[PDB]
């Protein structure tokens, strides 16, 4: 029966490929050819956040666009005031090897995790005024790669165990487990409505997940190597993924296929982070080649370059209002560009 | 806006306190040497952890040598797809690669050699030295001294290999045991010496799972790694 299973899966994949080909009447690049390109935009380092001891690996902007949380593997999780550079909080982590951080939309809680396989929740606004561990989510069997708050009580977490999990913070139990990814899940992105999220899992495939239904709604396999970064297009109908193949690819939840690819011959290194501007015209992706390329989401060209970082870029995030984009790096410095 | 400036002053005070705390943490961190313990599951790395200590995805073993803080990390409960979580250990002082030299048949020795090749050739680990603990030396001695499990069957170049004149075997070991030991060592040197960049160095060590010197071996390896890094910075290497 296993051979019949292989044959059936192969012909199902062929059918889906044919269906995607049928919808491919015209590519995004050709349709967007007539639009005026963004041209050349030169974003410069506006704020340099210093204080992290080890290399920074994750970051997340707050909804207020003022406070931001960053994670470095020195056992410290610093919250920075973007406007003044003042560190609002400096949370010592029980596990040094933190790989993810998340700032709650209301800002009352912060989550982080890593090789400890625990997504620790930190309460920033305890009545005593101190920051203390609120809940420890230890049900994952692998390193936490990414985490994102749906709300003060719901957090989606990705783990090295190749499965994503939806956690109820108050009870600290897996409300729903997302299985289907063959490889290690690296990045998470919550949709604007918080009803859908996508992730790439080291299998060159991106999967669409239903937060409430808890099932794999769609799968995308445009990439050639491990996907390290994923982010929805600001409208929530599409998302871009960064992969070790040195290319970014845009996928639409309705077309169910790769709309376009962002790449150039000189870039051979892997991709660590990807994010969209508020309008979604600019795709900002962090690269292993020590700089970040600004990609025109429509015209398929590099609109700009952020070459201020001295080490690998690990994380990249744009403020919800789009005022500025902050790029983290392995040099232990966060640079805010605008 | 007097209230805004008062809030700014309070934030500045909090920032200064956080700067003091981060300076203390930096002083502690730079004085602490992180070590990644890695190797085959069937290897003796767990026994070495037990000697040094005498559900989580990573285990912290803290030990002191000559009042020097060492934070050895054992990566347990993690899937064997190491290419991602291994990248987190680029800044560790050394990677303690524990290989059971006697685990040649699956041929776990060849798997360990491939894992060492990946570790050495990884882009982000090119700055990290590897402490190669050639563990299970007694098992290898027993296997080769009074066993027909010929090494050259699983390593044909072994029949052509000869013990280097620079070898310093333990007095009493049979010539075959020393030959196999140094053959395995040089096979691991295939990767370490092939790069030739001098950016990071490998420190093979013939070790047994219960040797107390292993801690001293790690201490000496860290000394050598730091000294070589400083010398290369000073153009002396």
């Amino acid at each position, epitope marked *: 029966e296993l051979d019949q299973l*292989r044959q059936e899966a192969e012909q199902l*994949k062929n059918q889906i*490929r044919d269906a995607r080909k049928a919808c491919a009447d015209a590519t995004l690049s050709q349709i967007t050819n007539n639009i005026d390109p963004v041209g050349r935009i030169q974003m410069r380092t506006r704020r340099t956040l210093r204080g992290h001891l080890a290399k920074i690996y994750a970051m997340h902007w707050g909804t207020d666009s003022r406070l931001l949380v960053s994670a470095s593997q020195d056992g410290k999780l610093i919250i920075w005031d973007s406007y003044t550079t003042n560190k609002v909080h400096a949370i010592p982590l029980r596990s040094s090897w933190v790989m993810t951080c998340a700032y709650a939309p209301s800002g009352n809680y912060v989550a982080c995790g890593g090789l400890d396989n625990i997504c620790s929740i930190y309460n920033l606004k305890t009545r005593e005024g101190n920051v203390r561990v609120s809940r420890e989510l230890a049900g994952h069997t692998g390193y936490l790669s990414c985490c994102r708050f749906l709300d003060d009580n719901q957090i989606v977490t990705s783990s090295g165990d190749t499965t994503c999990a939806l956690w109820d913070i108050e009870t600290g139990q897996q409300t729903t487990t997302f299985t289907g990814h*063959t*490889g290690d899940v690296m990045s998470l992105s919550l949709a604007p409505d918080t009803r859908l999220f996508v992730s790439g899992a*080291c*299998d*060159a*495939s991106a999967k669409l997940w239903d937060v409430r239904e808890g099932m794999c709604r769609q799968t995308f*396999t445009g990439h*050639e*190597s*491990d996907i390290n970064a994923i982010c929805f297009f600001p409208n929530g109908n599409a998302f871009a993924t960064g992969s*070790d*193949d*040195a290319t970014c690819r845009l996928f639409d939840l309705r077309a169910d296929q790769e709309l376009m690819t962002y790449s150039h011959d000189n870039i*051979i*290194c*892997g991709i660590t982070s990807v994010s969209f501007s508020k309008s979604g015209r600019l795709l900002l992706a962090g690269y292993d080649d020590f700089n970040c390329n600004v990609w025109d989401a429509l015209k398929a060209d590099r609109a700009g370059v952020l070459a201020g970082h001295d080490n690998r870029v690990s994380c990249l995030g744009v403020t919800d209002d789009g005022m500025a984009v902050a790029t983290g790096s392995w040099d232990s410095f966060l640079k805010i560009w605008n | 806006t007097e209230d805004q400036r008062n809030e700014e002053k309070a934030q500045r005070e909090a920032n200064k306190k956080i700067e003091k705390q981060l300076q203390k943490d930096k002083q502690v961190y730079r004085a602490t040497h992180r070590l990644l313990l890695l190797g085959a599951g069937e290897s003796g790395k767990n026994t070495i952890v037990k000697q040094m200590r005498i559900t989580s995805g990573i285990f912290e073993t803290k030990f002191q040598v000559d009042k020097v803080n060492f934070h050895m990390f054992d990566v347990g409960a993690q*899937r*064997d*797809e*190491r*290419r991602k979580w291994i990248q987190c250990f680029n800044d560790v002082t050394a990677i303690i690669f524990v290989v059971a030299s006697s685990s040649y048949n*699956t*041929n776990r020795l*060849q*798997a360990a050699l*491939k*894992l060492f*090749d*990946s570790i050495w*050739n*990884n*882009k982000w680990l090119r700055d990290t030295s590897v402490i190669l603990f050639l563990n299970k030396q007694d098992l290898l001695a027993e296997k080769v001294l009074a066993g027909k499990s010929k090494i050259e*069957d*699983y*390593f*044909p*170049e*072994f029949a052509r290999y000869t013990t280097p004149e620079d070898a310093t075997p333990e007095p009493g070991e049979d010539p075959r045991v020393t030959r196999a030991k140094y053959f395995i060592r040089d096979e691991f040197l295939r990767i370490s010496t092939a790069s030739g960049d001098g950016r990071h160095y490998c420190y093979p060590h013939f070790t047994c799972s219960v040797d107390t010197e292993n801690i001293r071996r790690v201490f000496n390896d860290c000394r050598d790694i730091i000294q070589r890094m400083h010398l290369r910075q000073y153009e002396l290497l």
Partner: nanobody
Amino acid sequence: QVQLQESGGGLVQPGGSLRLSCAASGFTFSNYKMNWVRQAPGKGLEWVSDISQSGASISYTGSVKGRFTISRDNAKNTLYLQMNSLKPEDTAVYYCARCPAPFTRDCFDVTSTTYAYRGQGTQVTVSS
């Protein structure tokens, strides 16, 4: 979609030859280091041989050195493993495995857990 389809295999007498093939698709074949791994009945996955991107560098496991020949042809996105003088111990399912990232000689595809960039595998059986 990353696809690796091994072809060739089946019963073969000891001491014979067997030319395995691997049709690659969905990625730039030349940009990734390729290698062969096998899983004999009851034993774990074992690395057999690897070939660099350009094919100028090749390595074989000691039990395979001088017995099997690994070759690749980037012109048709295919990888080969020319097996000669097969032994009974060689009986195993040979999985055509690709290394994770391109342009890097690093490789982490001997993982026991399900590896995404290895093919279904072709059964190779050696019997008298």
